[PDB]
Design a protein around this ligand. Structure first.
Ligand SMILES: CC[C@@H]1CN(S(=O)(=O)N(C)C)CCO1
Ligand SMILES: [Zn+2]
Length: 140
């Protein structure tokens, strides 16, 4: 579990979004595994605006943050998980690291701020849903 709190937005994995998220929906995309809802209180996070390929992510199933190199966001085949079928997912980056289903929502960060959240795992990789292209998160 986990979210990004930027401005008056909450960014969560689409598959973990709550009823309140859907009732306060700003934007969602199944292909990216993302959903954004509106918040009453402003949030503490800053979104990275960059093309870094190195950062640090939080792994809840290890209680640890790990430094990683990661691929640029792309369209990637993802094998079946407990929460999605095998399918293509867009806006995805990959690193070598540990990720189980409940690690989704852990932040990946670089020197510029939050890059994305854990969204995929298995076979010794961790996949992150990018948010650095969502420039509208920084306003309004
Ligand atoms: C040639 C396909 C893809 C699309 N991606 S993407 O935006 O990250 N996304 C999956 C749409 C970037 C690289 O090229
Ligand atoms: Zn960066």
């Amino acid at each position: 579990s986990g979210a990004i709190y930027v401005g008056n937005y909450r960014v969560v994995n689409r598959h973990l979004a709550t009823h309140n998220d859907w009732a306060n929906l700003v934007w969602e995309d199944s292909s990216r595994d993302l959903l954004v809802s509106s918040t009453t209180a402003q949030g503490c996070d800053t979104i990275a605006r960059c093309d870094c390929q190195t950062g640090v992510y939080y792994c809840s199933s290890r209680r640890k943050h790990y430094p990683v190199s990661f691929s640029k966001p792309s369209l990637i085949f993802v094998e079946a998980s407990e929460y999605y079928p095998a399918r293509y997912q867009s806006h995805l980056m990959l690193a070598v690291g540990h990720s189980e289903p409940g690690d989704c929502g852990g932040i990946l960060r670089c020197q510029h701020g939050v890059v994305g959240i854990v969204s995929t795992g298995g076979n010794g990789l961790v996949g992150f849903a990018d948010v650095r292209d969502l420039l509208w998160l920084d306003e309004e």
